[PDB]
């Protein structure tokens, strides 16, 4: 409703670096807000794409940002009669970033890893890896829970059980208030997908450079399965957290599995022990129901509600025809211990191939009316197909079925304007929460400032 579309702020990164693929707000020890941006195709030391992270200070004019430097050198360790190897080439560092406290977490989902023992090997596979940084102290650390030293032969003998060689840990990342990092690894367990969790504090204290294979006792990974419904479901394609059981001591996880059950798609709500509480199934095959998930209380009943994106959902139209436009599903949490019912609201895209529902960002209370609002992205939507972001306001009855505002892309075609969103943070400290919109296609980030309501 009251985001300022006239006077935006632009941050830009290196050409072809996909600067803006992922972003997030970041407060230092003093509460000073800065933007953290991921550029997964930024050139490394050998003029080869390794990815990179940028930490942008708030500035009404924006501009260029300094790099949050990480180690980008491939590592080797000859230990226990084995050879451990990390391969960072085309790893996609910054394919996802999240900030918690004064710590930043940037993940390279396609960082490869291999082990050699004589004439055998584990296989060179994308286990992924996360890089943790504390900008103020200069502290650094890593977390790569899917690394292993089992040889190829073993997996074959065991019928490829608990095979975590393709996890791509960090595909999606979230952090609980308590400070537990939760990584979505859609490739884990031979493409079933898995979740890995570990306390940030413990990740730091247990890490040392050069070791490559170390233990994090407090870590917790989800489980494998023999059920074909889970096969190639990419469990952990997207992740989120919230409160969905009434017990405020426990934190619940929300996992998207966009191709679950033969591309039907689904999203499940679990406890910290990966026990399923609810499961919402897709409405249509290949719609990619679960591509994105958001958690926030939109009707002001104190209970977190769920939002699910299906960016490829095809809408039924005249003469028995279907039009790929995308869709968002709202699920309101019922009072007390009850199952989430049918969707309370179905928001559907308008532009063909617009991919409405590709991203969904909680804005907090944008207009300050007492109900939380959200933003929904259609990266290839708008009459010009350049990208569009639609704001929907909260209300006692959930959400408004029509958008309160529509942000058209300030960039040129192909920018993927809206592929990443982040809100609910007041970056200019004017009392109103703001929105940052990434357009990796254009290697830029647009900042929208919320202003006092005009009407």
């Amino acid at each position, epitope marked *: 409703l009251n985001l300022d579309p006239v006077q935006l702020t632009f941050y830009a990164g290196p050409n072809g670096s996909q600067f803006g693929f992922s972003l997030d707000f970041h407060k230092d020890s003093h509460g000073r807000v800065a933007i953290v941006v991921g550029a997964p195709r930024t050139l490394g030391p050998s003029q080869e794409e390794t990815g990179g992270v940028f930490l942008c200070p708030w500035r009404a004019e924006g501009g260029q940002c300094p790099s949050l430097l990480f180690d980008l050198r491939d590592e080797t360790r000859n230990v*226990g*009669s084995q050879t451990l190897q990390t391969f960072k080439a085309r790893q996609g560092l910054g394919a996802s970033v999240v900030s918690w406290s004064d710590v930043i977490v940037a993940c390279a989902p396609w960082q490869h890893w291999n082990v050699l023992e004589k004439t055998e090997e584990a296989e060179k596979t994308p286990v992924g890896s996360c890089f943790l940084a504390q900008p103020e102290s200069g502290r650094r650390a890593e977390y790569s829970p899917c690394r292993g030293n089992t040889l190829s032969r073993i997996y074959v003998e065991n019928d490829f059980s608990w095979d975590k060689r393709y996890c791509e840990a960090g595909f999606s990342s979230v952090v609980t208030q308590a400070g537990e990092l939760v990584l979505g690894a859609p490739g884990g367990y031979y493409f079933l997908g898995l979740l890995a969790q570990a306390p940030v504090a413990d990740i730091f204290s247990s890490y040392r450079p050069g*070791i490559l*294979l*170390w*233990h994090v006792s407090s870590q917790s990974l989800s489980f494998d399965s023999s059920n074909p419904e889970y096969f190639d479901g990419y469990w952990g394609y997207s992740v989120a957290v919230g409160e969905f059981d009434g017990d405020l001591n426990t934190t619940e996880y929300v996992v998207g599995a966009p191709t679950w059950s033969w591309t039907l798609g689904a999203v499940e709500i679990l406890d910290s022990y990966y026990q399923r509480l609810h499961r919402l199934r897709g409405e249509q095959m290949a719609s990619y129901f679960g591509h994105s998930v958001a958690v926030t209380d939109v009707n002001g009943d104190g209970r977190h509600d769920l939002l699910v994106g299906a960016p490829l959902y095809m809408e039924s139209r005249a003469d028995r025809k279907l039009a790929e436009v995308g869709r968002v599903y709202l699920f309101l949490q019922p009072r007390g211990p009850h199952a989430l019912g049918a969707p309370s609201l179905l928001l559907t895209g308008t532009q063909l191939y617009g991919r409405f529902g590709s991203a969904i960002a909680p804005l907090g209370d944008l207009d300050r009316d007492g109900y939380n609002d959200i933003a929904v992205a259609a990266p290839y939507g708008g009459p010009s197909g350049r990208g569009q972001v639609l704001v929907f306001l909260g209300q006692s009855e959930g959400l408004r079925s029509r958008p309160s505002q529509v942000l058209d892309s300030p960039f040129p075609t192909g920018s993927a304007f809206g592929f990443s969103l982040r809100g609910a943070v007041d970056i200019d400290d004017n009392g109103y929460p703001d929105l940052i919109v990434g357009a990796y296609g254009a290697n830029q980030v647009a900042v929208y400032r919320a202003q006092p309501v005009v009407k």
Partner: antibody
Amino acid sequence: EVQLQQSGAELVKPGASVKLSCTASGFNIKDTYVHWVKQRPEQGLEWIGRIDPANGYTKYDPKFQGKATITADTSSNTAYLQLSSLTSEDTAVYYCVRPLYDYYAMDYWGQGTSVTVSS
Amino acid sequence: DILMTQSPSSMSVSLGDTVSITCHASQGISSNIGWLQQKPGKSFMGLIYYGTNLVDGVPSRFSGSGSGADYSLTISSLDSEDFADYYCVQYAQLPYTFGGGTKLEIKR
């Protein structure tokens, strides 16, 4: 806290077979590797072998191959070391070990198990 | 098997001293070494792992160093408990192998 409670002192006759145990406290044995080490006054320390209690795979120093047998039961959260055809040279103190962070390290040690082979 | 030549076998020193133990290998082991401590009539305690990294709980007066086939454990300002047996172990290759050991004794 990580603690490895090894079995009590054992006293057996030559030719017999003893089975030492190493129960884990404050953690799940299945977590890391579990090595067994032999110590003697003059001969000093010697690595026997190790086991991954998760999958049950073992590695031995070719010196002990045949004499030593390492196993682990995740149920009782305990790892074992069985020695057969005992002799006087087998008289030694045995330690079960596991790493702290580094997968291949030797950081945490059990209190030890005294073994004496005599008639 | 990799041999671990640890020296000296023993040394008589007083408190507050800064002594250093050394460990040579029959071949390189890329800082894949660990230092152990065994107080008289007691079990073992991990001091260092991967060359230089202190095991949680170990005093900072301890420090591991070196590279290749030669490494050294150093104790700055000896304490009354520091008088004990110390061993080095390599886990660069299987089987793991230990050093001869070094006994710190009180001088007089």
